């Protein structure tokens, strides 16, 4: 049933933030987001995001 | 007044509930027109005698089509075609302030927070359900109820995630999300809750408060099954009767004269089965759980009133044997129960949607089917998430180079422009196709060619009958 060891979760992060992310987390992949649409005032129109696949901690 | 292309190619219907509301309807129509809406209809509820005419889907499509309606603007849900607009056609119903705020902020704001439905208690929530806590049937049930409560389901963690649903402190997602730090500033302050946070709102139809709110919060000391059982019993147990859930859903005999056999391929956490059984019985339905060891002929002979089967998988041998014993039995899934609850009418599965039958075997893998989508609003986004999930793929609200497909119904917006260019780049080669490709692949259980001309039609909004979720419904 439930996902287990070695699986990952999706985390949406500012591209600027990736280099500062906790280095003890294992990143499986990182993808640059394109054509982002802000649907909240809290997100600015030109914010550049990425998606990181972060491995579940052991 | 200022102008823009904000509402380009979108159709609106404004429902006026009282004569005094006409100036608000006029100002909203001006806002829509000045920002390039395709069409704006105003309909005065108070000026037709609707209580003697069936305002069903055919009535609505004939009166307000043939093109689709992208949004209904209404400060109330108290109009007789709300259920077919919202639960069937999947058209958002939003207050006038959604238009005002969307123009002010120059963007299409999320519709959930602007729903006038008082049962949409979770409208301000963006909820991540942990797949390392729950099996597939639990995940689907919690997703269904979150959606019925007006919340947004997300499959990614961000600084906008308001709630993370977990089963127990043993879920490794808790420590993983808690370690999302930068340096050490956290991505945000996290709220981990047990699924009874969802269930209480659904069962009681009122906000969680006081000690019951605190009991729904993740407690790292809850390391035993017994402790989890005890919290479930206090929050949604038989001493918490549905105080006003039936005020908002007044058909208390929805399931009268129906008796549901529950397949063993639904392996719920046991107090979640108790919740589901109580939900059915509170609506005057009857429940019999089936076991893999039952002699089905004996069970159906002893309970000849059983007329419905509820199961997770279309390919269960229990279901095959059941159909040979009871050829006329209703065959549905748990989502079907909640759809009938939303419609407030018992409805044969053939008149419901593709997602209301026990699920096909996975047609695709995630490597084959990881789809972005664009130009869908409100409950359409939930539907495409579910459709992709039961096809065997993954869905994403964002577009990246990981995506294999972009699903769209029109040519507007940034993602369509980017993905069309990517489709011509041999280094990328993403496929752009419409939602009828997804729907027909599932309905025919076959990997159809997404470049067929019928799936390259990006003017589907020209016909309301092509709304996503309509394929597969019998009249």
Swiss-Prot record, chain A:
Post-translational modification: Phosphorylated by ATR (MEC1) and ATM (TEL1) upon DNA damage. This appears to be required for the function with the RAD1-RAD10 endonuclease.
Localization terms from the record: Nucleus; Cytoplasm
Miscellaneous: Present with 274 molecules/cell in log phase SD medium.
Self-association state and partner proteins as the record states: Forms a heterodimer with SLX1. Interacts with RAD1; catalytic subunit of the RAD1-RAD10 endonuclease. Interacts with RTT107.
Function according to Swiss-Prot or TrEMBL: Regulatory subunit that interacts with and increases the activity of different structure-specific endonucleases. Has several distinct roles in protecting genome stability by resolving diverse forms of deleterious DNA structures. Component of the SLX1-SLX4 structure-specific endonuclease that resolves DNA secondary structures generated during DNA repair and recombination. Has endonuclease activity towards branched DNA substrates, introducing single-strand cuts in duplex DNA close to junctions with ss-DNA. Has a preference for simple Y, 5'-flap and replication fork-like structures.
Annotated family: Belongs to the SLX4 family.
Protein's name in the database: Structure-specific endonuclease subunit SLX4
Organism field: Saccharomyces cerevisiae (strain ATCC 204508 / S288c)
Included range, full protein: 535 to 587 of 748
UniProtKB/Swiss-Prot annotation, chain B:
Residues of the full protein shown: 2 to 486 of 1070
Note: Present with 1380 molecules/cell in log phase SD medium.
Protein's UniProt name: Regulator of Ty1 transposition protein 107
Protein purpose: Required for resumption of chromosome replication after DNA damage, specifically in S phase. Is recruited to chromatin in the presence of RTT109 and RTT101 in response to stalled replication forks and acts as a scaffold during DNA repair.
Subunit text: Forms a complex with the cullin-RING ligase (CRL) RTT101(MMS1-MMS22). Interacts with MMS22 and RTT101. Interacts with histone H2A; requires H2A to be phosphorylated (gamma-H2A). Interacts with RAD55.
Free-text description of this protein's post-translational modifications in UniProt: Phosphorylated by MEC1.
Membrane-spanning segments: none
Residues annotated as domain BRCT: 2-103, 117-202, 249-341, 358-442
Organism whose genome encodes this protein: Saccharomyces cerevisiae (strain ATCC 204508 / S288c)
Positions carrying Phosphoserine: 293
Subcellular location: Nucleus
Domain of life, source organism: Eukaryota
């Amino acid at each position: 049933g439930p996902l287990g060891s070695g699986s990952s979760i999706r985390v949406k992060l500012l591209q600027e933030s990736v280099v500062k992310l906790n280095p003890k987390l294992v990143k499986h992949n990182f993808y640059r987001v394109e054509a982002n649409d802000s649907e909240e005032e809290e997100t600015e129109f030109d914010d550049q995001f990425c998606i990181a696949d972060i491995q579940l901690v052991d | 007044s200022s102008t823009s292309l904000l509402f380009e190619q979108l159709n609106f219907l404004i429902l006026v509930a009282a004569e005094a509301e006409l100036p608000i309807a006029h100002s909203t129509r001006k806002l829509l027109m000045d920002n390039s809406c395709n069409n704006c209809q105003i309909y005065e509820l108070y000026n037709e005698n609707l209580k003697d005419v069936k305002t069903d889907k055919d009535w609505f499509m004939n009166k307000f089509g043939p093109q689709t309606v992208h949004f209904v603007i209404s400060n109330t849900i108290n109009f007789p075609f709300y259920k077919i607009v919202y639960f069937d056609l999947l058209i958002p119903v939003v207050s006038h302030t959604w238009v005002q705020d969307s123009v002010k902020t120059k963007r299409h704001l999320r519709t959930n927070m602007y729903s006038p439905n008082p049962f949409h208690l979770l409208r301000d929530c963006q909820v991540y359900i942990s797949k390392s806590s729950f099996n597939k049937c639990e995940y689907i049930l919690y997703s269904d109820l979150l959606h019925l409560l007006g919340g947004t389901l997300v499959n990614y963690i961000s600084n906008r995630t308001t709630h993370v649903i977990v089963q127990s402190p043993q879920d490794p997602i808790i420590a993983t999300v808690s370690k999302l730090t930068f340096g050490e500033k956290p991505l945000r302050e996290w709220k981990f809750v047990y699924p009874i946070w969802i269930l209480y709102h659904f069962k009681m139809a009122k906000p969680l408060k006081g000690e019951l709110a605190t009991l729904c919060e993740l407690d790292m000391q809850d390391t035993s099954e017994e402790q989890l059982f005890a919290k479930w019993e206090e929050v949604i147990g038989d001493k918490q009767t549905s105080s006003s859930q039936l005020t908002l859903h007044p058909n208390k005999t929805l399931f009268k004269n129906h008796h549901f056999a529950i397949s063993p391929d639904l392996n719920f956490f046991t107090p979640l089965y108790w919740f589901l059984k109580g939900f059915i019985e509170d609506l005057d339905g009857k429940v019999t759980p089936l076991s893999f060891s039952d002699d089905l002929k004996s069970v159906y002979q002893a309970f000849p009133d059983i007329d419905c089967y509820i199961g997770h998988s279309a390919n269960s041998p229990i279901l095959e044997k059941t159909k040979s014993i009871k050829p006329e039995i209703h065959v549905g899934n748990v989502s079907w129960l909640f759809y009938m609850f939303a419609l407030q009418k018992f409805t044969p599965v053939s008149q419901c949607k593709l997602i209301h039958q026990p699920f096909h075997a996975k047609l695709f893998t995630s490597k084959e089917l990881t789809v972005a989508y664009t130009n869908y609003f409100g409950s359409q986004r939930f539907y495409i998430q579910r459709l992709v999930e039961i096809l065997g793929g993954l869905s994403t609200p964002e577009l990246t180079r990981k995506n294999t497909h972009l699903i769209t119904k029109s040519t507007i917006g940034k993602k369509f422009k980017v993905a069309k260019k990517w489709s011509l780049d041999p280094q990328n080669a993403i496929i752009v196709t419409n939602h009828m490709w997804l729907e027909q692949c599932y309905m025919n259980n076959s990997k159809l060619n997404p470049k067929d001309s019928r799936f390259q039609n990006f003017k589907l909004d020209d016909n309301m009958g092509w709304n996503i979720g309509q394929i597969g419904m019998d009249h």
